[model samples]
Target: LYFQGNPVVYFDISIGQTPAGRITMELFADKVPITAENFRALCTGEKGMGQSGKPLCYTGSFFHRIIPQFMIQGGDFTRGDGTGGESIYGKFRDENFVYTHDAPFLLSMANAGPNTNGSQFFITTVPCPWLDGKHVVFGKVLEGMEVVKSIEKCGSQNGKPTKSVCITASGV
Candidate 1:
């Protein structure tokens, strides 16, 4: 179930001082326009500062949470610790579940609950069936699966990476 004309974005990641490879994602804008746009804006930082005083961007943000064989979570540009983040339009409701979290590298919104989506998101490292309806599946990795695998190796069971995994740059 691929959307032919969706937008593609890339993130240049790094572990501490060493540069990691790029992870490219294909956003499902056709299925989840509002959610996809929120992520796209954050990646490009074109929307500027969020209402919470933090830059609404993924650049310079850390992947904060990494659960090996599970998912890698980040995009909390506010706190970079999974506690804070804001969307371009403040906060938005969950988009439709037209896609499923049935494979690794699938991107999904990380929310506190219903309609609590902000800038936080996660990329699955393996199939996550339980998240099918809870998190909004809005994108998938189009390339650089090896980069994700490297980041996954840095994770401990506690979901914290041994080294800082940062998004040095990002853009659509």
Candidate 2:
């Protein structure tokens, strides 16, 4: 299916009690519509329940993993610990690597291995040339780099955060 244009979405984030501000992203629907649509639907919670028995949504989900100078991972509304998440299509394969992880704030899928993509995703903090054909780069941060930086500060070397970083709300 063709989207009218690349869709824009936002995530209202918070760290514990403090609002970290919004992180808006533009999905490359023209380049990877399937992958982009999966993310867009999760943000809006229009798909209802996933096969994992969890809501197909990113709202109330936590950024369960963080690696400073690397990337911040989240979207596991099922487990919230990086182990569980379900896509609108259950799980999917890498759509295409047309876009490279060549800069910070690029959005990409997080998976256990090839073809294991679910609801999990990550946002880069620095150029990740090594991730080139491994993860599908489907979107990017259009606004709120400061908010992403604030979330990055909560990361430890162990790729875990000291405080709770949650997506309190999300929408297209």
Candidate 3:
């Protein structure tokens, strides 16, 4: 009863023409309306109220920070560091999405504090239930998990990708 349709999103990730991996996720739109819509708009270049009041699209964005067996963080298209990116609403949205971060590839928002979620996010390689409620879990990985693991391998090195891992988010 949680889902009425197979709503999903895909992000093809690569490292310099090499297929590092892809990530297919099932969005919890019904559960997290605002967060889900924000992510979808970011994927499709929809305008937001933050950082130039732009779409803050995921295209060409890179993973700025990574932690093996922990998570891979990215989506800072502005500063390309862990300190940039803005929410679609020009400000932080409350933790509308609620779920346990107790599994791999649990897509959650990155925030400085409550409702501070911006374009930054992270994907877990293992269960991290401690992050529950503190972060918004809007989706879960449905495919391309191995590719995420491969990225984790790269993450093991200085917690950053040696090569550029570009993201192209889309539906299908």
Candidate 4:
């Protein structure tokens, strides 16, 4: 882990683009250790939360939420926060764990502040430098960012995506 947080890990994720292309992300594992670990678990289905375990998240999770030409958000165990009605996976309570925000396409551990984290994350579609030093930046976009750029944000009420985003697959 970097600075006792999760370090960045690279990945080839298919954001389910219409044309079809791979997006490379340097997942910030060093910035948010626990959060990144949790994401890795879901991505590889290594730990109990691994996609292979259930819902085949190992297959791919949803974008769930997004802001047009801005950012894409997802990672919730519950496919669509609105779809499942927050039934299957409960939200996390932050135990006052806070990290400085980093660059764009960076990942941060979302929460209400009580150590409550259960597989929900996001990526920047633009250069949100203002977020640096406050949010844990665990990665960057290396390719196919156009797909993310194309994400149209409908809205999100309590993590419920107004415009649903989906990930077709993720690869190394």
**Backbone clash count for every predicted candidate, in the order shown:** 0, 0, 0, 33
Per-prediction TM-score to the true structure, in the order listed: 0.96, 0.96, 0.87, 0.61
Q: List model 1 lDDT by residue over 31-93, tens digit each.
A: 899999898889999988878987889999999899998999998888778889999997788
Ranked by TM-score, the better of candidates 3 and 4 is 3
Regions of candidate 3 where Cα sits further than 4 Å from its true position = 1-6, 48-50, 53-55, 168-172
lDDT of 3 by residue, 34-64 (tens): 8777777776665744456444677778887
Backbone clash pairs in model 1 (N, Cα, C under 3 Å; residues 3+ apart or in different chains), count: 0
Could you give candidate 2's per-residue lDDT for residues 28-140 as a string of tens digits?
98989899999999999999988888889999999989999999999989987888999999889898989999999999999988888898999999999999999999999
* Inter-residue clash pairs, candidate 1: none
lDDT: worst 10-residue window of model 1: 1-10
TM-score of decoy 3: 0.87
Q: Pick the candidate with the highest lDDT.
A: 2
Candidate 2: count of backbone clashes, pairs at least 3 residues apart or interchain: 0
Q: After the best TM-score superposition of candidate 2, give how far the Cα of residue 156 lies from its true spot, in angstroms.
A: 0.8
Q: What lDDT would each prediction earn against the true structure?
A: 0.90, 0.92, 0.76, 0.49
lDDT, ranked from best to worst: 2, 1, 3, 4
lDDT of 4 at 169: 62
Go through the candidates in order and give the C-alpha RMSD of each one to the true structure: 2.0, 2.0, 2.8, 5.7
